[PDB]
Design an enzyme around this catalytic site. Structure first.
Site, PDB file in Angstrom:
ATOM      1  N   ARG A 255       0.822  -1.205   0.000  1.00  0.00           N
ATOM      2  CA  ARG A 255       0.000   0.000   0.000  1.00  0.00           C
ATOM      3  C   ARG A 255       0.859   1.258   0.000  1.00  0.00           C
ATOM      4  NH1 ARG A 255      -4.400  -0.224   4.645  1.00  0.00           N
ATOM      5  NH2 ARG A 255      -5.225   1.482   3.361  1.00  0.00           N
ATOM      6  N   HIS A 327      -4.749   1.224  19.401  1.00  0.00           N
ATOM      7  CA  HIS A 327      -5.161   1.835  18.145  1.00  0.00           C
ATOM      8  C   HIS A 327      -5.706   3.232  18.419  1.00  0.00           C
ATOM      9  CE1 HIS A 327      -7.895   2.418  14.578  1.00  0.00           C
ATOM     10  NE2 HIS A 327      -6.780   2.035  13.983  1.00  0.00           N
ATOM     11  N   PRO A 328      -5.146   4.274  17.802  1.00  0.00           N
ATOM     12  CA  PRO A 328      -5.608   5.644  18.080  1.00  0.00           C
ATOM     13  C   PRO A 328      -7.010   5.867  17.533  1.00  0.00           C
ATOM     14  CG  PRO A 328      -3.402   5.618  17.095  1.00  0.00           C
ATOM     15  CD  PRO A 328      -3.983   4.255  16.902  1.00  0.00           C
ATOM     16  N   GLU A 357      -6.093  13.146  16.030  1.00  0.00           N
ATOM     17  CA  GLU A 357      -7.215  12.843  16.915  1.00  0.00           C
ATOM     18  C   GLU A 357      -7.869  14.114  17.444  1.00  0.00           C
ATOM     19  OE1 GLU A 357      -8.296   9.768  17.138  1.00  0.00           O
ATOM     20  OE2 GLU A 357      -6.623   9.142  15.862  1.00  0.00           O
ATOM     21  N   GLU A 384     -12.137  13.068   7.699  1.00  0.00           N
ATOM     22  CA  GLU A 384     -10.720  12.721   7.694  1.00  0.00           C
ATOM     23  C   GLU A 384      -9.859  13.901   7.259  1.00  0.00           C
ATOM     24  OE1 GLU A 384     -10.023   9.686   8.840  1.00  0.00           O
ATOM     25  OE2 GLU A 384     -12.142   9.125   8.947  1.00  0.00           O
ATOM     26  N   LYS A 463      -3.333  -5.077 -12.829  1.00  0.00           N
ATOM     27  CA  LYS A 463      -2.071  -4.863 -12.129  1.00  0.00           C
ATOM     28  C   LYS A 463      -0.932  -4.604 -13.108  1.00  0.00           C
ATOM     29  CE  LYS A 463       0.923  -6.984  -8.628  1.00  0.00           C
ATOM     30  NZ  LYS A 463       1.144  -8.185  -7.775  1.00  0.00           N
ATOM     31  N   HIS A 487      -9.585  -3.668   4.001  1.00  0.00           N
ATOM     32  CA  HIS A 487     -10.744  -2.998   3.419  1.00  0.00           C
ATOM     33  C   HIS A 487     -11.625  -3.976   2.651  1.00  0.00           C
ATOM     34  CE1 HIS A 487     -10.621   1.536   3.721  1.00  0.00           C
ATOM     35  NE2 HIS A 487      -9.548   1.187   4.406  1.00  0.00           N
ATOM     36  N   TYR A 497      -9.972   7.597   1.030  1.00  0.00           N
ATOM     37  CA  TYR A 497      -8.658   8.220   1.166  1.00  0.00           C
ATOM     38  C   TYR A 497      -8.315   9.075  -0.050  1.00  0.00           C
ATOM     39  CZ  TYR A 497      -8.544   4.368   4.525  1.00  0.00           C
ATOM     40  OH  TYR A 497      -8.850   3.477   5.528  1.00  0.00           O
TER      41      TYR A 497
HETATM   42  C1  LIG Z   1     -26.329   4.594   8.955  1.00  0.00           C
HETATM   43  O1  LIG Z   1     -26.008   3.531   9.807  1.00  0.00           O
HETATM   44  C2  LIG Z   1     -24.603   3.235   9.768  1.00  0.00           C
HETATM   45  C3  LIG Z   1     -24.387   2.036  10.664  1.00  0.00           C
HETATM   46  O2  LIG Z   1     -25.401   1.058  10.476  1.00  0.00           O
HETATM   47  C4  LIG Z   1     -23.751   4.447  10.172  1.00  0.00           C
HETATM   48  O3  LIG Z   1     -22.422   4.160   9.749  1.00  0.00           O
HETATM   49  C5  LIG Z   1     -21.414   4.583  10.680  1.00  0.00           C
HETATM   50  O4  LIG Z   1     -20.912   5.894  10.375  1.00  0.00           O
HETATM   51  C6  LIG Z   1     -19.862   6.352  11.241  1.00  0.00           C
HETATM   52  C7  LIG Z   1     -19.519   7.757  10.805  1.00  0.00           C
HETATM   53  O5  LIG Z   1     -20.033   8.037   9.509  1.00  0.00           O
HETATM   54  C8  LIG Z   1     -18.676   5.396  11.165  1.00  0.00           C
HETATM   55  O6  LIG Z   1     -17.642   5.824  12.044  1.00  0.00           O
HETATM   56  C9  LIG Z   1     -16.417   5.912  11.283  1.00  0.00           C
HETATM   57  O7  LIG Z   1     -16.091   4.649  10.713  1.00  0.00           O
HETATM   58  C10 LIG Z   1     -14.919   4.660   9.893  1.00  0.00           C
HETATM   59  C11 LIG Z   1     -14.776   3.280   9.283  1.00  0.00           C
HETATM   60  O8  LIG Z   1     -13.507   2.761   9.662  1.00  0.00           O
HETATM   61  C12 LIG Z   1     -13.649   1.382  10.065  1.00  0.00           C
HETATM   62  O9  LIG Z   1     -12.371   0.780  10.197  1.00  0.00           O
HETATM   63  C13 LIG Z   1     -11.531   1.338  11.227  1.00  0.00           C
HETATM   64  C14 LIG Z   1     -10.178   0.653  11.139  1.00  0.00           C
HETATM   65  O10 LIG Z   1      -9.523   1.111   9.961  1.00  0.00           O
HETATM   66  C15 LIG Z   1     -12.217   1.134  12.583  1.00  0.00           C
HETATM   67  O11 LIG Z   1     -11.408   1.687  13.611  1.00  0.00           O
HETATM   68  C16 LIG Z   1     -13.592   1.818  12.578  1.00  0.00           C
HETATM   69  O12 LIG Z   1     -14.245   1.604  13.823  1.00  0.00           O
HETATM   70  C17 LIG Z   1     -14.454   1.345  11.400  1.00  0.00           C
HETATM   71  O13 LIG Z   1     -14.864   0.015  11.727  1.00  0.00           O
HETATM   72  C18 LIG Z   1     -13.716   5.034  10.772  1.00  0.00           C
HETATM   73  O14 LIG Z   1     -12.547   5.104   9.967  1.00  0.00           O
HETATM   74  C19 LIG Z   1     -13.954   6.382  11.469  1.00  0.00           C
HETATM   75  O15 LIG Z   1     -12.863   6.667  12.334  1.00  0.00           O
HETATM   76  C20 LIG Z   1     -12.329   7.957  11.981  1.00  0.00           C
HETATM   77  O16 LIG Z   1     -12.823   8.937  12.864  1.00  0.00           O
HETATM   78  C21 LIG Z   1     -12.496   8.716  14.246  1.00  0.00           C
HETATM   79  C22 LIG Z   1     -13.207   9.779  15.055  1.00  0.00           C
HETATM   80  O17 LIG Z   1     -14.599   9.479  15.053  1.00  0.00           O
HETATM   81  C23 LIG Z   1     -10.968   8.759  14.401  1.00  0.00           C
HETATM   82  O18 LIG Z   1     -10.625   8.502  15.750  1.00  0.00           O
HETATM   83  C24 LIG Z   1     -10.322   7.701  13.489  1.00  0.00           C
HETATM   84  O19 LIG Z   1      -8.903   7.761  13.597  1.00  0.00           O
HETATM   85  C25 LIG Z   1     -10.785   7.859  12.040  1.00  0.00           C
HETATM   86  O20 LIG Z   1     -10.172   9.058  11.567  1.00  0.00           O
HETATM   87  C26 LIG Z   1     -15.286   6.401  12.219  1.00  0.00           C
HETATM   88  O21 LIG Z   1     -15.141   5.533  13.333  1.00  0.00           O
HETATM   89  C27 LIG Z   1     -19.131   3.988  11.521  1.00  0.00           C
HETATM   90  O22 LIG Z   1     -18.051   3.071  11.380  1.00  0.00           O
HETATM   91  C28 LIG Z   1     -20.277   3.567  10.610  1.00  0.00           C
HETATM   92  N1  LIG Z   1     -20.742   2.233  10.953  1.00  0.00           N
HETATM   93  C29 LIG Z   1     -20.505   1.162  10.190  1.00  0.00           C
HETATM   94  C30 LIG Z   1     -21.055  -0.137  10.694  1.00  0.00           C
HETATM   95  O23 LIG Z   1     -19.875   1.240   9.141  1.00  0.00           O
HETATM   96  C31 LIG Z   1     -24.200   5.741   9.495  1.00  0.00           C
HETATM   97  O24 LIG Z   1     -23.645   6.863  10.171  1.00  0.00           O
HETATM   98  C32 LIG Z   1     -25.718   5.868   9.491  1.00  0.00           C
HETATM   99  N2  LIG Z   1     -26.134   7.021   8.708  1.00  0.00           N
HETATM  100  C33 LIG Z   1     -26.991   7.945   9.157  1.00  0.00           C
HETATM  101  C34 LIG Z   1     -27.523   7.731  10.544  1.00  0.00           C
HETATM  102  O25 LIG Z   1     -27.325   8.908   8.474  1.00  0.00           O
END
Ligand SMILES: *[C@@H]1O[C@H](CO)[C@@H](O[C@@H]2O[C@H](CO)[C@@H](O[C@@H]3O[C@H](CO[C@H]4O[C@H](CO)[C@@H](O)[C@H](O)[C@@H]4O)[C@@H](O)[C@H](O[C@H]4O[C@H](CO)[C@@H](O)[C@H](O)[C@@H]4O)[C@@H]3O)[C@H](O)[C@H]2NC(C)=O)[C@H](O)[C@H]1NC(C)=O
Ligand SMILES: *[C@@H]1O[C@H](CO)[C@@H](O[C@@H]2O[C@H](CO)[C@@H](O[C@@H]3O[C@H](CO)[C@@H](O)[C@H](O)[C@@H]3O)[C@H](O)[C@H]2NC(C)=O)[C@H](O)[C@H]1NC(C)=O
Ligand SMILES: *[C@@H]1O[C@H](CO)[C@@H](O)[C@H](O)[C@H]1NC(C)=O
Ligand SMILES: *[C@@H]1O[C@H](CO)[C@@H](O)[C@H](O)[C@H]1NC(C)=O
Ligand SMILES: *[C@@H]1O[C@H](CO)[C@@H](O)[C@H](O)[C@H]1NC(C)=O
Lengths: 596, 49
Positions: A255, A327-328, A357, A384, A463, A487, A497
C-alpha cells in the site's frame, strides 16, 4: 396540524431517544475498551443490540411517512436516511448468511497466520512478525516466499466466502433500485432535490479516472525514480526498465512506499529534523504534548478543551493487569462528550497522530447543538480531511521553530525540502493509484461485468497495465489476492482516502491563501491566522444540512475535487524527479515477466 | 406556553399529530421527560441551583 408537523415531531422524538441510546452504547464500548472484562463485554453487546433494535423499529415505523410532501429539504433527507439505513429488505435467511460470512471473514482475517516450511512446530500471526519482516528484512527470496505463502493461505480459502458475499450483495442491490452494490456505495455522495447542485452516482468513476490521468506523470516519474534507485540494490531481481516486484514495497500489501525511504533516500547526508531528541532532553511528556496541541488549537481560533473532554479522554495506559487497545481512536458519544483513546509515546509520529485525533474531536464538536441525524459530515472524506489538516499544519518546520524544539539555527534548502517532499509523496501518493485501481476493481466485482471465472485474470491484467507492478509469482483463479486486504475483508469503501487527500490539500491551500502566507507552499502555517479558522468553521457547522459542493465552495471556491493543489504542493519534487529521471526509462512493460 | 407561577408536571399523552390522540398510537409522545443529571455530562445536562 399537517404531515410536516407530524414528521418534525417524530424526527425530534427519534433524535432525542437515539442520542441517549447511542451515548449509552458508546459509553459501554468505551468502558470495554479501557477496561477489558467479561462484564464490560456483556454490557457493550447488550447496549449495541438494544441500539440496533431501536434503530430497526424506528426505521420500520418511519415507513409510513411519504417523502413527496416535505418542503423543508432537511426533514425529508432525515426521513429518507431513517427509512434506508435502519430497515431491512433482504429475507431472514439471506441476512443470516451474510452475517455468518462477515463473521467468518473477520475471524479468518484477525487470526491469519503463516510460518516457515516443513516446520509446523512454531508459527506467528501476520501482525506480530510478518509486518516486521516485510518492513525490515532485506532478503528478496524470503520476502517473496512469505508474500506468496500469505496470498496462498488467504485468497485460496477466502475465494468461496468472497464469492458468496458478493453474490449476496448483488442480490441486495437487485432488491434495491440502484444499478449494483458499487452504485449503492457511490450513492453516498449523491445529492438530489436541489437545482444547480444535483449529482449522479456514476460521475464519481469519471472524476476519479480524470484525477488519476492528471496525476499520472507524477506517479510514473516517482515509479521510475524508485526503480532506478532499487536497480543499485536488486539489479537481477528487478528489470532496469520493467516493473518492480510486488513484495519489495516494504509491506505485505504494497500500500505505502514509506518503508523504502531509508533504502532509497536521495540524500542521506543532510541533517534531519529530530524533535524526539529535544523532546526527550527537555522532558516533553504526554501531558505537555496534549497541552501544546490545545494551545495550537486555541491559536487557530478553535475553543479549548473543557473539563469533560480532559476527564473523559485517556492519556496514558494504566497498564499492569489492565489491558487496552493502542489503536488511536477519537470518540464521539454525543451529549457533549468526546474522548480520545490512543497509546501515546514521545515521537513525532505520535505527535502527528495526537494532532489528528484532536482535529477529529474538534470536528465532532462543531455540531453539538445540531440534530443527531445531522451530527455528521456530508461526505465521508470531509471528516478525515479536517482531522488531517491540523496535523499537516503542525508538521511544518515553522511551528517547530516557534515552539523551540527545532533548533533556531537550523537551515532549509533544496536537498532537505526535496527529501521531505519525497517522504510525503511516498506516504500519500504511493497508494492513490492503488486506491483508484482497487476501487475500480471492487466496482467491477460488485457490478458483475467481469466474469467470475475471469476475476483473477482481469486483476492481473489491471495490475500489469495500470498499476505498473508485475507479479513475482502468478496465481490462478483458485486464489483471491484482494481478499488479503483489511478494506476488502470488511467490505469498506476504498475511495475515502483518495477524496480525503484532495479535500485536505484544497483546504490547506485555501487556508494558506487566506492567511496571506508567503514563500513555497510546503512551508506554510495557520497558527496565527484566525480568518482561516473562521473559514474552516463555516464548513464545520454545515454538516449534512448543506450539500458537500456548497461546503467545499465556501472554503476553496471549487465545485468539484481538484488535484491541482496536490500537484502544486509537489512542484519542486516533480522538477527534481524530472531532472533525476533523465537517464531512467519511464513506463511499465507488460510483456516482461519475472517468472520466465 | 404556560402562565406565571405554574407547577405543570404531567407525563400525559402529548397531542403531537393532527389526530385526537386521546389514547395512544403512532406520533403520540409525552411532553415531560426525564432529565438525567449526570456529573460527567457538561453543557445541557448540568444542575444549577
Ligand atoms: C447509517 O447507519 C450506519 C451504521 O449502520 C452508520 O455508519 C457509521 O458511520 C460512522 C460515521 O459516519 C462510522 O464511524 C467511522 O467509521 C470509519 C470506518 O472505519 C472502520 O475501520 C476502522 C479501522 O480502519 C475502525 O477503527 C472503525 O471503527 C471502522 O470500523 C472510521 O474510519 C472512522 O474513524 C475515523 O474517525 C475517528 C473519530 O470518530 C478517528 O478517531 C479515526 O482515527 C478515524 O479518523 C469512524 O469511526 C461507523 O463506522 C459507521 N458504521 C458502520 C457499521 O460502518 C451511518 O452513520 C448511518 N447514517 C446515518 C444515521 O445517516
Ligand atoms: C425546517 O424545520 C426546522 C425544525 O423545526 C425549522 O427550524 C426552526 O426554525 C425556527 C425559525 O424559523 C426556529 O425558531 C427560533 O426561535 C428562536 C426563539 O426561541 C429565535 O431566536 C430563532 O431566531 C428562531 O427563529 C426554530 O428553533 C428552529 N428549530 C430547529 C429544531 O432548528 C426550519 O425553520 C424549517 N424550515 C423551513 C423552511 O420551514
Ligand atoms: C475495571 O473493572 C473492574 C471490575 O469492574 C474494576 O474492579 C476495576 O477497578 C476497573 N479498572 C481497572 C483499571 O481495572
Ligand atoms: C482556552 O484555553 C485557555 C483556558 O483558560 C485560555 O487561555 C484561552 O484563551 C481559551 N480560549 C478560548 C477561545 O476559550
Ligand atoms: C534549487 O533552488 C533554486 C532556488 O534558487 C531553484 O530554482 C531550483 O529549482 C532548485 N533545484 C532543485 C533541483 O529543486
Amino acid at each position: 396540524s399537517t404531515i410536516e408537523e407530524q414528521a418534525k415531531t417524530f424526527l425530534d422524538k427519534f433524535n432525542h431517544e437515539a442520542e441517549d441510546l447511542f451515548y449509552q452504547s458508546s459509553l459501554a464500548s468505551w468502558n470495554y475498551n479501557t477496561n477489558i472484562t467479561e462484564e464490560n463485554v456483556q454490557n457493550m453487546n447488550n447496549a449495541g443490540d438494544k441500539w440496533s433494535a431501536f434503530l430497526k423499529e424506528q426505521s420500520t415505523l418511519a415507513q409510513m411517512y411519504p417523502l413527496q410532501e416535505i418542503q423543508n429539504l432537511t426533514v425529508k433527507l432525515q426521513l429518507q436516511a431513517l427509512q434506508q439505513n435502519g430497515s431491512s429488505v433482504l429475507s431472514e435467511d439471506k441476512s443470516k448468511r451474510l452475517n455468518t460470512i462477515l463473521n467468518t471473514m473477520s475471524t479468518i482475517y484477525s487470526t491469519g497466520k503463516v510460518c516457515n516450511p516443513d516446520n509446523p512446530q512454531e508459527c506467528l500471526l501476520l501482525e506480530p512478525g510478518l509486518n516486521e519482516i516485510m518492513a525490515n528484512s532485506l532478503d528478496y527470496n524470503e520476502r517473496l516466499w512469505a508474500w506468496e505463502s500469505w496470498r496462498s493461505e488467504v485468497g485460496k480459502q477466502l475465494r468461496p466466502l468472497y464469492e458468496e458475499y458478493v453474490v449476496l450483495k448483488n442480490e441486495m442491490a437487485r432488491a434495491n433500485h440502484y444499478e449494483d452494490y458499487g452504485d449503492y456505495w457511490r450513492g453516498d455522495y449523491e445529492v438530489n432535490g436541489v437545482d444547480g447542485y444535483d449529482y449522479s452516482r456514476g460521475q464519481l468513476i469519471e472524476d476519479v479516472e480524470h484525477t488519476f490521468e492528471e496525476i499520472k506523470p507524477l506517479y510514473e516519474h516517482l515509479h521510475a525514480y524508485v526503480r532506478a534507485k532499487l536497480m543499485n540494490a536488486y539489479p537481477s531481481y528487478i528489470s532496469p526498465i520493467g516493473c518492480l516486484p510486488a513484495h519489495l514495497l516494504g509491506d505485505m500489501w504494497g500500500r505505502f512506499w514509506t518503508n523504502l525511504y531509508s533504502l532509497t533516500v536521495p540524500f542521506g547526508q543532510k541533517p534531519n529534523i529530530d524533535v524526539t531528541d529535544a523532546m526527550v532532553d527537555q522532558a516533553w511528556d504526554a501531558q505537555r504534548i496534549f497541552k501544546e496541541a490545545e494551545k495550537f488549537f486555541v491559536s487557530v481560533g478553535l475553543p479549548n478543551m473543557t473539563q469533560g473532554f480532559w476527564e473523559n479522554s485517556m492519556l496514558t495506559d494504566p497498564g499492569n493487569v489492565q489491558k487496552a487497545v493502542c489503536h488511536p481512536t477519537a470518540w464521539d458519544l454525543g451529549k457533549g462528550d468526546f474522548r480520545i483513546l490512543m497509546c501515546t509515546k514521545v515521537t513525532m509520529d505520535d505527535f502527528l497522530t495526537a494532532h489528528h485525533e484532536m482535529g477529529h474531536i474538534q470536528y465532532d464538536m462543531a455540531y453539538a447543538a445540531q440534530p443527531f441525524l445531522l451530527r455528521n459530515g456530508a461526505n465521508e472524506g470531509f471528516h478525515e480531511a479536517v482531522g488531517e489538516i491540523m496535523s499537516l499544519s503542525a508538521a511544518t518546520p515553522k511551528h517547530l521553530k516557534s515552539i523551540g524544539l527545532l533548533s533556531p539555527d537550523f537551515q532549509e534548502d533544496n536537498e532537505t525540502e526535496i527529501n521531505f517532499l519525497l517522504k510525503q509523496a511516498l506516504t500519500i501518493v504511493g497508494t492513490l493509484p492503488f486506491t483508484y485501481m482497487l476501487e475500480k476493481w471492487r466496482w467491477m466485482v460488485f457490478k458483475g461485468e467481469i466474469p467470475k471465472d475471469q476475476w483473477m485474470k482481469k486483476w492481473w491484467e489491471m495490475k500489469r497495465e495500470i498499476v505498473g507492478v508485475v507479479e513475482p509469482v502468478p496465481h490462478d483463479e483458485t486464489y483471491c489476492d484482494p481478499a488479503s486486504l483489511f478494506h476488502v475483508s470488511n467490505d469498506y469503501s476504498f475511495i475515502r482516502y483518495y477524496t480525503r487527500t484532495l479535500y485536505q490539500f484544497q483546504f490547506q491551500e485555501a487556508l494558506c491563501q487566506a492567511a496571506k502566507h508567503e514563500g513555497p507552499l510546503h512551508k506554510c502555517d495557520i497558527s496565527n491566522s484566525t480568518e482561516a479558522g473562521q473559514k474552516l468553521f463555516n464548513m464545520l457547522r454545515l454538516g449534512k444540512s448543506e450539500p458537500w459542493t456548497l461546503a467545499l465552495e465556501n472554503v476553496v471556491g471549487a465545485k468539484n475535487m481538484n488535484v491541482r493543489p496536490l500537484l502544486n504542493y509537489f512542484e519542486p519534487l516533480f522538477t527534481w524527479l524530472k531532472d533525476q529521471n533523465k537517464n531512467s526509462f519511464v513506463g511499465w512493460s507488460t510483456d516482461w515477466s519475472p517468472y520466465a | 406556553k404556560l402562565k406565571p407561577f405554574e407547577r405543570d408536571i404531567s407525563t400525559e399523552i402529548y397531542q403531537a399529530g393532527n389526530k385526537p390522540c386521546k389514547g395512544k398510537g403512532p406520533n403520540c409522545y409525552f411532553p415531560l421527560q426525564s432529565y438525567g443529571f449526570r456529573p460527567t455530562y457538561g453543557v445541557g445536562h448540568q444542575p444549577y441551583r
